[PDB]
């Protein structure tokens, strides 16, 4: 089994961050070089990897800042006129087209499309003025020379290239580039659109479950996705447990699904809360193409594309809180949109938890660890020690009591390097880069 | 001399505005000065003679105004009598208000535009008019011009002394138009006072007196409205500034009528709209209509588009 070793930290160093300092999404690139991080207020930041200087091999470079640009400004939608917000919900990286590195970005109601490019040349000289800006006489011009390009330092930029604004009634919460570098989708809480990357004035509604009378809301969409190898298989989740899997081949309007993954609820658990603790939160596919994790509130579950009524595996994240559920409901912590992330090769899973814990179960050996992110007890190139939670009073110098966990430092968003083992857990205000212990 | 070139300039301005194209600040300044010097003559109460086609809220929906012009006859062939509210969430509010004021300036007899409650500097600043001016003109001079122009607009209007028209409701401190002639209009409408009730009050189906949820004005009941109607020797009162599903709605024993002229308000309520046609025999009618099909909007079309074939 692998070992995890604290290897970097970023962002603020204190514990008194403002509102626009809460890291709200983290999404690696396709290769692994860049790493976006769009904290609240719109301040998307981008960390480049220090490329491997062949003099030092083992020390895979630490992360350095590469650019920075405001994404979304506050707004007022006079039609409804309340509080159009400046959060950042979902960053996604388009593949490599040219020396640029495009990336989508979305507040609650408008999806931009940025671009990160490099400039290292400038013109030097004129024909009406000198470099000072002091104009010469418009008659003193006798010969003509053309401005030439002379080298300069390196510089970056981030220009909003398109804006897919004003199409969703409710709040956008998911994006997924499709499979063919041409389209993508974006699912609000009751609709689903399907844009085209180079057309900013149209869309194609493709799923609608809005009841005519808005009294009976039973299900709401909570996450969508495509297939990383199929052109026509999007797998939008729901809010009652089901995970429909439409198919854009049979009929255009995919309101008629082609499967329905659904757990046959067991009367041994439903007491007062199953209908609220059995809501899917982020349905991710797997780099292979077959499995599809769905982190609900209390249990990671690995489904399969060939077994409707039952998961293949199952895991428990913080099952010791099924009693605390009541108290957790008293401060709205029972509602918390968590998230997971696969391995680079389908072998390990992970998911955030409470009090800065982030387990990582194992596919083959069924083992599960429980680390803890904290600046104080570690230093670069140290080694992390698997913690241990305890439900009862058996507190012997190696555990943390259930009645001592602080349900205020929630590690929601995480990531995982698409090839190697460099994960990036994003706490409430920092961007830990636990690197592996390469040997 | 100057009159002929001014009329030709106004004709060119109207023709250009008819295809949704704005103007320059010098043109706006000249038109605002001319509108000032024209409207300074008309008193608060204005007696416009029949025939006329009463209108309602437009709230900056330019395409709805064009549909109205296509429904109830193009100006200046048919008279018109608006009731304010050229702001608050229209997509082309500046175009609508400049078209209306240009028509008023060129045809100072055919058309008459009343004063709305929503055309006050703070109100337009809050409800997007200031934002529209900033994003289209690049400054706030035109907004100031329009706001100072708004003071000269008449409070109410009269038709043969029987049909009374106003933007909102009546006031408890006001009993007849003789106080209206005494009231000054060259000041900002406050959140309190008889003018605020004139512009913000509403009639209610329930009895008694209630406070409007908008934080200003007090809702007069059936009794006060009826007493005013039989005291002033009128037949009915025509008001606006209330969204109703069926376009027009009679109220308070057919004494006060509610008229809306912006179909599909805010593009979501999906209501209807109507305009009270008034003839020479004073036989009031209604002409319900639906919002015109538009183009350029981001279409969430269930039908497949041309990029996905």
């Amino acid at each position: 089994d692998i070992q995890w070793c604290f290897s970097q930290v970023k962002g603020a160093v204190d514990d008194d961050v403002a509102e626009a300092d809460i890291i709200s999404t983290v999404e690696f690139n396709h290769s692994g070089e860049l790493l976006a991080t769009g904290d609240k207020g719109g301040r998307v930041v981008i960390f480049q990897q220090e490329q491997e200087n062949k003099i030092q091999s083992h020390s895979r470079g630490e992360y350095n800042v590469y650019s920075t640009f405001q994404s979304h400004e506050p707004e007022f939608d006079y039609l409804k006129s309340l509080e159009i917000e400046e959060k950042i919900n979902k960053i996604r990286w388009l593949p490599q087209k040219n020396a640029a590195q495009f990336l989508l970005s979305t507040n609650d109601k408008t999806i931009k499309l940025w671009k990160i490019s490099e400039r290292d040349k400038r013109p030097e000289g004129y024909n009406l003025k000198e470099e000072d800006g002091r104009y010469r006489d418009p008659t003193t011009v006798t010969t003509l020379r053309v401005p030439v390009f002379r080298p300069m330092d390196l510089m970056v930029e981030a220009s909003p290239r398109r804006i897919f604004a004003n199409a969703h009634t409710y709040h956008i919460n998911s994006i997924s580039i499709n499979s063919d570098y041409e389209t993508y989708l974006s699912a609000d809480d009751l609709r689903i659109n399907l844009w085209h990357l180079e057309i900013t004035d149209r869309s194609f509604n493709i799923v609608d479950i809005k009841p005519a009378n808005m009294e009976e809301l039973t299900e709401v969409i909570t996450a969508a996705e495509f297939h990383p190898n199929s052109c026509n298989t999007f797998v939008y989740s729901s809010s009652k447990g089901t995970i429909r899997l439409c198919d854009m081949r049979a009929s255009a309007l995919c309101d008629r699904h082609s499967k329905l993954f659904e757990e046959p609820e067991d009367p041994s658990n439903r007491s007062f809360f199953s209908e609220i603790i059995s809501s899917i939160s982020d349905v991710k596919f797997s780099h292979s193409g077959r499995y599809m994790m769905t982190r609900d509130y209390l249990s990671v579950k690995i489904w399969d594309l060939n077994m409707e009524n039952r998961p293949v595996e199952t895991y428990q994240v913080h099952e010791y809180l099924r009693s605390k559920l009541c108290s957790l409901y008293e401060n709205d912590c029972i509602f918390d949109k968590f998230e997971c992330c696969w391995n680079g090769s389908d072998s390990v899973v992970m998911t955030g938890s409470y009090n800065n814990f982030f387990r990582m179960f194992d596919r083959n050996t069924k083992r599960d660890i429980t680390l803890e992110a904290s600046r104080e007890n570690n230093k670069p190139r140290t080694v992390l020690k698997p913690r241990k939670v305890c439900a009862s009073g058996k507190r012997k110098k190696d555990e943390i009591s259930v009645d001592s966990l602080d349900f205020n430092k929630k590690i929601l968003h995480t990531a995982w390097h698409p090839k190697e083992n460099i994960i990036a857990v994003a706490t409430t205000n920092n961007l830990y880069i636990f690197q592996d212990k390469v040997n | 001399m100057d009159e002929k070139v001014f009329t030709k300039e106004l004709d060119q301005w109207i023709e250009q505005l008819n295809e949704c194209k704005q103007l320059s600040e010098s043109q706006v300044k000249s038109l605002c000065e001319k509108a000032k010097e024209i409207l300074t003559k008309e008193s608060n109460v204005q007696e416009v003679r029949c025939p006329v086609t009463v209108c309602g809220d437009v709230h900056g929906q330019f395409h709805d105004l064009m549909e109205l012009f296509r429904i109830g006859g193009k100006s200046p062939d048919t008279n018109y009598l608006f009731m304010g509210d050229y702001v608050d969430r229209g997509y082309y509010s500046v175009e609508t208000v400049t078209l209306l004021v240009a028509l008023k300036v060129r045809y100072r007899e055919r058309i008459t535009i009343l004063r709305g409650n929503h055309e006050s500097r703070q109100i337009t600043q809050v409800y997007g008019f200031y934002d529209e001016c900033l994003r289209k003109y690049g400054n706030a001079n035109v907004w100031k011009y329009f706001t100072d122009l708004f003071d000269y607009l008449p409070l109410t209007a009269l038709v043969d002394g029987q049909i009374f028209c106003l933007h909102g409701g009546l006031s408890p401190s006001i009993d007849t138009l003789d106080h209206i002639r005494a009231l000054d209009r060259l000041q900002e409408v406050p959140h309190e006072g008889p003018m605020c009730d004139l512009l913000w009050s509403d009639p209610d189906d329930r009895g008694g007196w209630g406070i409007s949820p908008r934080g200003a004005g007090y809702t007069f009941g059936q009794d006060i409205s009826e007493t005013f109607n039989h005291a002033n020797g009128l037949t009915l009162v025509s008001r606006a500034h209330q969204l109703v599903m069926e376009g027009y709605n009679w109220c308070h024993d057919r004494n006060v009528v509610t008229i809306f002229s912006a179909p599909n308000y805010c593009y979501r309520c999906g209501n209807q709209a109507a305009i009270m046609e008034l003839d020479d025999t004073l036989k009031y009618s209604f002409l319900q209509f639906d919002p015109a099909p538009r183009r350029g909007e981001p279409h969430v079309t269930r039908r497949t588009p041309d990029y996905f074939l």
Partner: peptide
Amino acid sequence: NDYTSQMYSAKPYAHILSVPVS
């Protein structure tokens, strides 16, 4: 067992309910 006597979950997705106009 639990004592928050209720049988609804329209709380988290509240704005999805009416909040209709004005």
